[PDB]
């Protein structure tokens, strides 16, 4: 017996990266998983390095980030790599989730990797939100203020919880220092959950774009998917390079180059772009608590896809109506994103409410109806 199979430690690596049996027909949308692992490794390397030069005290935080930009050798690169990779992480995670929704990766027997996946997505949001506060510029402070005040909506104890999170009566030094400690920790928690969802997946293996079993026709993960992953790694690195070296601030807000000032409020307080659809959903509900519930539900509702999809077939490759519905759902999600950063003005107020209704009605009404009808069309149509 080969050592890679005989030795228990080597055999664990072997089972995931080398002999792992994969479908022979994965398309390029199966490459986002390895790009997400790459983003995670970049964020750990750049993040730990920034931690060596950053100071979490509110009197020094913003200046420690300027010191990184100006004095630390290659500090500008490490800082911009960390800031831009946070955006790339969300592009890859939305692509990975969209792949999963289009191809029915949430269906049995892959409910458990999908459900742990939903938690990974929540941890990424928290991680990224706390890291953005660490700069302690105007958007850092004011974004922390408004987002942390949503907790005040929790009945009875909400105000007390907010003061407890802040460690005082407003966002200040205690909040910044605790956000640093938690921002350092959360990526390690996220890596554990990422590993858990892969171990859960390993019982069924990867799904594939046709939605059928691949047990009839497997390929080793290496060398085939190793070399196919290199193509998208280099494509990702080219996009990374164009932002980090040629346009490092395109994805950012200029107000975060102004030191936090609790007196002056910025013109518009918006989250980072990747949180914008959830912010639009929150604005749509007039009630404070209503809005917070809706915003959380917009993520947790992903957990019901295994139930509301009534199809006898996995994935959308052969379902023209489902494909149209999916197209509208995705575009609506992008429009919600745009509406998250417009001013609260006509006619965007009502439009945001209609897009919010469409978002939820996909899960609750349309997907159950369309998947029911398509089952019948496949049966009658092929008689």
């Amino acid at each position: 017996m080969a050592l890679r199979k005989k030795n228990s430690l080597l055999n664990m690596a072997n089972s995931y990266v080398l002999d792992s049996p994969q479908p022979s027909n994965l398309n390029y949308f199966w490459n986002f998983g390895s790009l997400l692992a790459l983003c995670l490794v970049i964020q750990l390397a750049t993040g730990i390095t920034l931690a060596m030069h950053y100071t979490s005290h509110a009197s020094l935080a913003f200046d420690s980030v300027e010191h990184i930009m100006r004095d630390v050798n290659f500090g500008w690169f490490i800082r911009y790599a960390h800031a831009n990779t946070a955006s790339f992480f969300f592009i890859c995670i939305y692509a990975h989730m969209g792949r999963n929704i289009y191809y029915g990766s949430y269906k049995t027997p892959r409910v458990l990797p999908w459900s742990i996946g939903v938690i990974i997505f929540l941890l990424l949001i928290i991680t990224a939100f706390m890291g953005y506060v660490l700069v302690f510029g105007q958007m850092s402070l004011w974004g922390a203020t408004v987002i942390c005040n949503l907790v005040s909506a929790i009945p009875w104890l909400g105000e007390d919880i907010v003061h407890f999170l802040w460690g005082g009566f407003s966002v200040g030094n205690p909040t910044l220092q605790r956000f640093f400690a938690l921002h350092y920790l959360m990526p390690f928690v996220l890596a554990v959950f990422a590993l858990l969802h892969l171990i859960a997946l390993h019982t069924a293996g990867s799904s594939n774009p046709l939605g059928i079993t691949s047990n009839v026709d497997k390929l080793s993960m290496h060398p085939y998917y190793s070399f196919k992953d290199l193509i998208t790694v280099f494509a990702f690195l080219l996009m990374f390079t164009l932002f980090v070296f040629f346009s490092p601030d395109k994805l950012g807000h200029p107000d975060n180059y102004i030191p936090a000032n609790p007196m002056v409020t910025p013109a518009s307080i918006v989250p980072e772009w990747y949180l914008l659809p959830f912010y639009a959903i929150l604005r749509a509900i007039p009630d404070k608590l209503g809005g917070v519930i809706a915003m959380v539900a917009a993520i947790l509702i992903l957990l019901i896809l295994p139930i509301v999809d009534r199809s006898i077939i996995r994935g959308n490759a052969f379902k023209p109506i489902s494909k149209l519905l999916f197209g509208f759902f995705i575009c609506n999600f992008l429009l919600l994103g745009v509406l998250g950063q417009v001013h609260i003005e006509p006619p965007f107020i009502v439009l945001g409410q209609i897009c919010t209704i469409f978002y939820f009605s996909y899960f609750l009404i349309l997907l159950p109806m369309v998947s029911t009808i398509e089952n019948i069309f496949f049966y009658i149509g092929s008689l």
Binding site: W76, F77, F227, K228, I231, A235, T241, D249, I258
Partner: protein
Amino acid sequence: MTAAEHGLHPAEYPWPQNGMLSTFDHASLRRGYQVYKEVCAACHSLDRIAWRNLVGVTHTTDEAKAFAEELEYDDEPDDEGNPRKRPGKLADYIPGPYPNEQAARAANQGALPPDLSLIAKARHGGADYIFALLTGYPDEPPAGVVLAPGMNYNPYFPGGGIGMARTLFDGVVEYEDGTPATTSQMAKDVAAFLTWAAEPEHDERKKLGLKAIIVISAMLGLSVYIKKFKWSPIKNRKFIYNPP
């Protein structure tokens, strides 16, 4: 929001540094430092820039040491623990015009002139915003605009009423390189200088980016060849089925 509340959007000017392969023009940077020093520095600090930062960008080591040595900085206390001053060194930061915010506001009718070290990154528009603002004070406000006292009309500034008056006029500076100091020329130079102050890694970054682009592109091409090479037995596979 109304266009006035947003501010007029500045034109896209063709800066020398626009261009994937373009550095700053260092002669413009040096002239822009001179505008900063003779005009802006009366009200605005540049606190993130040290004298050493000018060296080999705009000035030689000796010129920058001369600028530093003309100033006095707080030293460590003497042996009786009394305060002392020392001459400046290259490690020192460029000193600001006011001791605190309160003094700054008192000298500017309540308005606080921001530090200019990050201003090119802290405003939408960057160099174009600085150039447009400095050169965009109309002689007369559009009919109907009511300025608050101590405000000046400038359409680029959001809301229109800015606490900073026009400061650049033809020949307020005499450039040491013989360039005609027109309003436009001075605004262009100081906007270049401030852009450099906000992003002093700019030139190095874009050159490193060129090397990265070239290497990564070649690796992308080779990775395509290698993937196709390795996958060809799978892509080329053929089957003959004889039903049992």
